[PDB]
Amino acid sequence: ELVQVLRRGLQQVSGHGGLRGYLRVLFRANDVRVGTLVGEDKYGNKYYEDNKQFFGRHRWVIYTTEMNGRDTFWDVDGSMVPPEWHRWLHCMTDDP
Amino acid sequence: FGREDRFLNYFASMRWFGGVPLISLGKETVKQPVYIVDVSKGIINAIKDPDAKGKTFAFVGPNRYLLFDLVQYIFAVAYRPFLPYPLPHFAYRWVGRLFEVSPFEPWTTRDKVERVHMSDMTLPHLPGLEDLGIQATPLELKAIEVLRRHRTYRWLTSEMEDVKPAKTVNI
Amino acid sequence: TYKFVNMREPSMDMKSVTDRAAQTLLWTELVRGLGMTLSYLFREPATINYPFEKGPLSPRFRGEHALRRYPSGEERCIACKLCEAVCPAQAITIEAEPRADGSRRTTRYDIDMTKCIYCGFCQEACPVDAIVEGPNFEFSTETHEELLYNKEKLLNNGDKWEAEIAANIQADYLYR
Amino acid sequence: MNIMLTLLTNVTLASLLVLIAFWLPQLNAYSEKTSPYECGFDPMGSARLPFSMKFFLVAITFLLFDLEIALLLPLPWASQTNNLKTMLTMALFLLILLAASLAYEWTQKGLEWAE
Amino acid sequence: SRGEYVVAKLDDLVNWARRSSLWPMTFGLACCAVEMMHMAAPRYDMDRFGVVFRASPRQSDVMIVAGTLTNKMAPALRKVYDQMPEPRYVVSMGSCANGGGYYHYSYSVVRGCDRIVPVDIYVPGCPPTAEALLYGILQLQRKIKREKRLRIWYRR
Amino acid sequence: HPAAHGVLRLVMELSGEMVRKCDPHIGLLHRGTEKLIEYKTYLQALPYFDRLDYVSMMCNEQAYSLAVEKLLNIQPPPRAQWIRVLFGEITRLLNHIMAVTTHALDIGAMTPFFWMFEEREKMFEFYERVSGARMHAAYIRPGGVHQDLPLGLLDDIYEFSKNFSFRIDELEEMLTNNRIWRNRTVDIGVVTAEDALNYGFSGVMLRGSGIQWDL
Amino acid sequence: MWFEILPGIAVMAACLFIPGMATAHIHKFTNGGKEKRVAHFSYQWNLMERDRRISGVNRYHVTKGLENID
Amino acid sequence: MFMINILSLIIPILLAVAFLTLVERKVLGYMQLRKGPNVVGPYGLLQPIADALKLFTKEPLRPATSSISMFIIAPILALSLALTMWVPLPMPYPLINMNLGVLFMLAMSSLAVYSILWSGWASNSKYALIGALRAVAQTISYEVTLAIILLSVLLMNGSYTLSTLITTQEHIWMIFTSWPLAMMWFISTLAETNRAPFDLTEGESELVSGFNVEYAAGPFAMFFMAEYANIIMMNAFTAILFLGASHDPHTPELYTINFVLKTLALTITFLWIRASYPRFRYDQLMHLLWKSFLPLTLALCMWHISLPIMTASIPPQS
Ligand SMILES: CCCCCCCCCCCCCCCCC[C@@H](O)O[C@H](CO[C@H](O)CCCCCCCCCCCCCCC)COP(=O)(O)OCC[N+](C)(C)C
Ligand SMILES: CCCCCCCC/C=C\CCCCCCCC(=O)O[C@H](COC(=O)CCCCCCC/C=C/CCCCCCCC)COP(=O)(O)OCCN
Ligand SMILES: CCCCCCCCCCC1=C(C)C(=O)C(OC)=C(OC)C1=O
Ligand code: SF4
Ligand code: SF4
Ligand code: SF4
């Protein structure tokens, strides 16, 4: 079952838009998982879902690189999430 | 003079080079140091005093000391061996110039060389701290709070009244 | 009814004595502890990837305070000062007067967030659902003064978080 | 020759690390900062006061038992002698007395710390 | 200029090193320290950010005032704050430490730890959640990233 | 000090490492709660009991609510009492986890702390779902509880409870039979039943010496 | 994951490889490529000194065979 | 060219220590259901560099009551001795080939304790003094048993030369002949490196920081590097002593690789042990070493003196 995990890693590499996208998501979030896209903000944040992860890892956001006035390629924080996706992300509701 | 000054700390810092270089052995220089709290309180009182608007004040201490005796007292309070030697003005100016090349805060400068060995002027025509309600704090009462940091472990607990205050040239 | 915790005797047969001697000389329970730690080593960790992943919360969660509006935009607050009276930490300061149109409205509504205990007593006491504790908890500051909220700050918080606040209230108002 | 160079290199590297650590960063030393630490408060007494040693007897025995090692370390070379019976007898004799010395101090309560 | 670029890059390196290795003192006072423990727990795992508790103040970079500071305790907090070598940072956590909180009018409570030590980050809550404390720590990291000590020295 | 719980100044006289005298100095966390309560209504004074023992919050809420109800001569409804007992047992679990794991940390077994604080986090999720606050819930009030349980809470509590036993088993596997743990704990701090009764002890400090007592 | 611990272990293993490999390569480079001679006793040192003397270039590792006996 | 070899020894050892810190943090994290450093660089590979740069750009402080000369000397001695311990190790060739390498390592290890003692005394603080006295007690506990265990194990080697241990284990590991001595030696090395469950001198739960509580910044970092280098060196020495890797004279890289994996496994075993157990009391450590380890060690010394004579298996090279 080793070849299975190696192929899943290769699929994660290929599913992020190539090697450059893989390193982008590796250095921007320290996480290279691939999930189902749920939606996108008007500010650029992308929201993904994977119900096979345990409670806490089944929902996550990929933050935008440029919010209202600042460059957020490296400087991201939890306060950049808009209220509706804040409610969805913290599992206060099951509906995006 | 105070905890973060460059006057007592500066003299105290001179122990590292072994001997204390003094121009004319500090026998031709008179100093009248003033406490930091006295100056700050004088500024505060000058703000609140309506008569102090367009005046000029001189803030000086209660005692005048020869530089040699002042440095000797400083080393005595810090319990460090005092080894004063005379150094010519040109040589010690050269030392100051050599120290001036530091890109960081210089340990000393030629300007410091000049100012240390200049006697403090006497200006009796100017109002002083006593005209702002302040009694000048003598150095012998506040020297320990600055120089106790410069002692070794063996003399840290020595009391303030142990170190025989220095001789004062009061007119 | 009760039970004893340390009232068992070891059997003194040669089998048990030899087993205990082997335990002493060969460190079997230490190996058992090592095995438990090794078992935990290969488990999936419980860490989440904050700030990209967040801990789960509830509609009842008490966060930053906010002042709400009616659907017409009118302020819900009527300066009844129930929240000020009930506030266990005396964190609310309220002043009021009749408005230019004769309405009962506040002129001062301050919450000292460094006095606050976030108990939610104020939103319980409010009769018009004007003051609430929002879902936001990420509002750390660099100076103390920024945590002294006036009426403008609370009204801006309400205007900014109303979309989530109304949905959270809709999910819990039947328990209140 | 090589070992002296190695020791000099190691000591020089350590001293240079100390020098870098002590001259590179910014220093702001004041009396409160450099004071002795006892978790919130000023010490009552001095750290140079006598500190009782409850294992003082085992410390003296360690001195005698450490020299047992000096007498036993040439054993690998002693196994190459022709009169193996004599060497084995004396080697076993030396360890037996070391075992008996431990047994004497154990049975006379010498291994228990002072109360 | 060349020197401006050099000092800017050196500032970048030093700030990255300092914010990527933040060691808070093992120091807590009340209810807030429980949430500090939970922020050290496996769910949040502050050690993955490079944040490790160290008992000795000499070996600590940050002080988190987590709990009520009483009058009897203030000299001890000031002592352990002073013994911290520089650069040092202070994070105030919880209402009690921020402004006195629910014991603000007490006779034996200091009305905020900023009367005793300078504060860099104020974390609100009673107690702030472990996630809120992690947010405050990351905000402190972002604030450290903005330091320009060597640029200021060069422009002197 | 890592073993002083933050606010304990223990002045000890030592001969070597033997402890000649223990003089605990307290008051480093005295906030004058009892005087502050006099300026509050009973409802306003309730949240102080959350912060009295911050590891067992709802238990202090229950004690204060029972005192106030006894003074009021009123009776809580049965469902409130059942919720109170359920959450008091959850709180006892939280408290015993904290006590055991911090104890093992002080001796040196630092690993079970991390294993058990995940369960503690789940129980904080239970508190937050029921009251909106993770630890200082203020759920138990004189007269009953503040709010009814949300739909689905009992199922999640059952799911947690049917698995907590294996976590206890893993802790007990790491500590109970270990000879280092026994050498550090067996015959340490032995107190007699008469001394425990006369010194004002209660709870486990009484039951450990053979006294059969539980309130 | 547990396999994310592996990169640090691999870096540490790469660091630990270097000393022995470098020592072997330096011994071969400075001893004619033939595994630097070991002299634990005086006879081996005598052999080394004789080898140095008869080499003609003051190097022990320069070995003279049967071609040096005309 | 010899200085090149000295550097190629010392610098990779420092890098290995730096990344051993990260390996410890991640391993203990994963045994505790967490991850450990994974943000500062990919998989936390940049964490040690950040730690070192932070530590060496932080202000070091001289305690007012401290004795300055010994205070500065102690970390220098610690780091220099930690670096020196590596020179006689055959991997498969040693930098310094000694007739008596094992006893040299014994003497240097015995000298290393004085760094801890002198730092604790010169700090002039109560906790540092308690740590130094605990170090005295620990050495008194382990020294004699460790030395006699080395004697008994090396009796089958025939000399004190470290490179002979490769020849001695050409067909079988020495452990298959002296595994009780191997277990006692493993525990003795755990005690010798001040590692859990015998990390008494630092005593973080009890003594806050112990002997190094006064130390800050760069001087503190050198103590840390010295301790971790000593851990790696002790595990490498144990691997040489009890797990003999086959050496091919024409391909020494195979021996180097085998050696490195074995010493890494032993270091991870220390890390696991730290993650698994509570801490001893420092009188209980001496009772364990003097009432259980010492009698078995004496008996096995007698047995290992007698065995080569009984079976006519005395090794060569008097
Ligand atoms: C050789 C021995 C002597 C020198 C000793 C030092 C050894 C060299 C130092 C190693 C440098 C590595 C540091 C670079 C890591 C930066 C990682 C990156 O993330 O930085 C970003 C940008 O980089 C930084 O701005 C600056 C880093 C680089 C600094 C400039 C290079 C200077 C090198 C000069 C070398 C000279 C050394 C001294 C010689 C005497 C900021 O992102 P960040 O906010 O963190 O992460 C957000 C967290 N998220 C992703 C989870 C959301
Ligand atoms: C035919 C002729 C054969 C000749 C004789 C050979 C037969 C020998 C049979 C017996 C050998 C036993 C060897 C074990 C030696 C010590 C055993 C021991 O009893 O020690 C323990 C204590 O030892 C320990 O428990 C260890 C404590 C530290 C634990 C650290 C981690 C545990 C080790 C992890 C795995 C070990 C792997 C070691 C080998 C690694 C590879 C080199 C005793 O302590 P107590 O139970 O408290 O009893 C004292 C009062 N009666
Ligand atoms: C290693 C596990 C993480 C420990 C985190 C450090 C905790 C610092 C707070 C001090 C403290 C401790 C230790 C503690 O145990 C405790 O409970 C009695 C407190 O009361 C809230 C404390 O404040
Ligand atoms: S939540 Fe409680 S403490 Fe905060 S303002 Fe409302 S009533 Fe006052
Ligand atoms: S917020 Fe609500 S309770 Fe407070 S004064 Fe306004 S209407 Fe009354
Ligand atoms: S702020 Fe609240 S939770 Fe924190 S210590 Fe004070 S009362 Fe306890």
Tab-separated table of C-alpha atoms in Angstrom, chain F residues 74-187:
chain	number	residue	atom	x	y	z
F	74	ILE	CA	-37.708	26.982	46.177
F	75	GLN	CA	-37.137	23.826	44.140
F	76	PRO	CA	-35.488	23.429	40.721
F	77	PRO	CA	-37.360	21.359	38.114
F	78	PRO	CA	-36.205	17.736	37.702
F	79	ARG	CA	-34.695	18.199	34.230
F	80	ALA	CA	-32.543	21.046	35.546
F	81	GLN	CA	-31.296	18.794	38.356
F	82	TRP	CA	-30.452	15.988	35.923
F	83	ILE	CA	-28.575	18.421	33.667
F	84	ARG	CA	-26.776	19.740	36.756
F	85	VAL	CA	-25.635	16.258	37.784
F	86	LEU	CA	-24.575	15.332	34.239
F	87	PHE	CA	-22.512	18.488	33.822
F	88	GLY	CA	-21.095	18.131	37.334
F	89	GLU	CA	-19.780	14.697	36.402
F	90	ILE	CA	-18.354	16.124	33.167
F	91	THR	CA	-16.701	18.789	35.325
F	92	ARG	CA	-15.328	16.135	37.682
F	93	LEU	CA	-13.803	14.428	34.645
F	94	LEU	CA	-12.190	17.697	33.527
F	95	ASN	CA	-10.871	18.384	37.038
F	96	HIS	CA	-9.439	14.901	37.575
F	97	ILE	CA	-7.770	15.001	34.160
F	98	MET	CA	-6.153	18.326	35.041
F	99	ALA	CA	-5.067	17.121	38.487
F	100	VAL	CA	-3.596	13.802	37.322
F	101	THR	CA	-1.852	15.203	34.244
F	102	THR	CA	-0.341	18.188	36.067
F	103	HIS	CA	0.767	15.854	38.862
F	104	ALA	CA	2.500	13.565	36.355
F	105	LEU	CA	4.051	16.656	34.760
F	106	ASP	CA	5.521	17.783	38.097
F	107	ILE	CA	6.992	14.198	38.625
F	108	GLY	CA	8.012	14.182	34.966
F	109	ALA	CA	5.503	12.121	32.971
F	110	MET	CA	4.774	14.910	30.515
F	111	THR	CA	3.139	12.831	27.778
F	112	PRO	CA	-0.347	11.957	29.193
F	113	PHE	CA	-1.048	15.686	29.612
F	114	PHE	CA	-1.204	16.097	25.829
F	115	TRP	CA	-3.323	12.966	25.370
F	116	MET	CA	-5.888	14.060	27.945
F	117	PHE	CA	-6.174	17.736	27.032
F	118	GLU	CA	-7.772	16.731	23.724
F	119	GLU	CA	-10.598	15.160	25.737
F	120	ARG	CA	-10.598	18.322	27.853
F	121	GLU	CA	-10.984	20.367	24.659
F	122	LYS	CA	-13.975	18.246	23.636
F	123	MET	CA	-15.561	18.847	27.044
F	124	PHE	CA	-14.931	22.584	26.597
F	125	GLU	CA	-16.787	22.216	23.300
F	126	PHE	CA	-19.685	20.755	25.296
F	127	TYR	CA	-19.643	23.757	27.661
F	128	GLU	CA	-19.463	26.212	24.769
F	129	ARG	CA	-22.337	24.532	22.925
F	130	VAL	CA	-24.531	24.543	26.028
F	131	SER	CA	-23.690	28.054	27.301
F	132	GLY	CA	-21.562	29.938	24.752
F	133	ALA	CA	-18.417	29.965	26.919
F	134	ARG	CA	-15.697	27.326	27.048
F	135	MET	CA	-14.941	27.373	30.783
F	136	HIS	CA	-16.698	30.213	32.657
F	137	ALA	CA	-20.108	29.151	31.426
F	138	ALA	CA	-22.321	30.494	34.285
F	139	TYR	CA	-24.974	27.942	33.212
F	140	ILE	CA	-26.136	26.821	36.622
F	141	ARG	CA	-28.184	29.504	38.324
F	142	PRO	CA	-30.459	29.623	41.377
F	143	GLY	CA	-33.720	28.116	40.187
F	144	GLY	CA	-32.269	25.792	37.544
F	145	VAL	CA	-30.178	26.303	34.405
F	146	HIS	CA	-30.058	29.257	32.034
F	147	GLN	CA	-30.902	27.478	28.768
F	148	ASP	CA	-32.100	24.080	27.617
F	149	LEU	CA	-29.732	21.705	25.864
F	150	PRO	CA	-29.529	22.204	22.084
F	151	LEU	CA	-30.705	19.343	19.907
F	152	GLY	CA	-27.957	16.793	19.332
F	153	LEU	CA	-25.904	17.536	22.458
F	154	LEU	CA	-26.792	14.257	24.189
F	155	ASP	CA	-25.661	12.182	21.199
F	156	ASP	CA	-22.257	13.887	21.146
F	157	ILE	CA	-21.879	13.494	24.918
F	158	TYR	CA	-22.656	9.785	24.493
F	159	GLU	CA	-20.093	9.520	21.683
F	160	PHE	CA	-17.422	11.104	23.892
F	161	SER	CA	-18.361	8.966	26.909
F	162	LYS	CA	-18.220	5.666	25.021
F	163	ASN	CA	-14.562	6.390	24.157
F	164	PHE	CA	-13.177	8.178	27.243
F	165	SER	CA	-12.577	4.790	28.902
F	166	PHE	CA	-9.792	3.846	26.479
F	167	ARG	CA	-8.047	7.161	27.174
F	168	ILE	CA	-8.216	6.348	30.888
F	169	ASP	CA	-6.807	2.908	30.056
F	170	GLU	CA	-3.874	4.421	28.153
F	171	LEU	CA	-3.080	6.828	31.003
F	172	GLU	CA	-3.241	3.944	33.481
F	173	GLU	CA	-1.036	1.842	31.197
F	174	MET	CA	1.563	4.613	31.238
F	175	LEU	CA	1.511	5.293	34.981
F	176	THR	CA	-0.077	2.690	37.259
F	177	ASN	CA	2.345	-0.242	36.984
F	178	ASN	CA	5.476	1.778	36.167
F	179	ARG	CA	8.119	1.243	38.841
F	180	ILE	CA	9.439	4.810	38.553
F	181	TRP	CA	5.955	6.215	39.182
F	182	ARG	CA	5.508	3.900	42.172
F	183	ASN	CA	8.943	4.841	43.527
F	184	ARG	CA	7.954	8.506	43.238
F	185	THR	CA	4.459	8.092	44.729
F	186	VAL	CA	4.350	5.080	47.085
F	187	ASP	CA	4.715	5.991	50.784
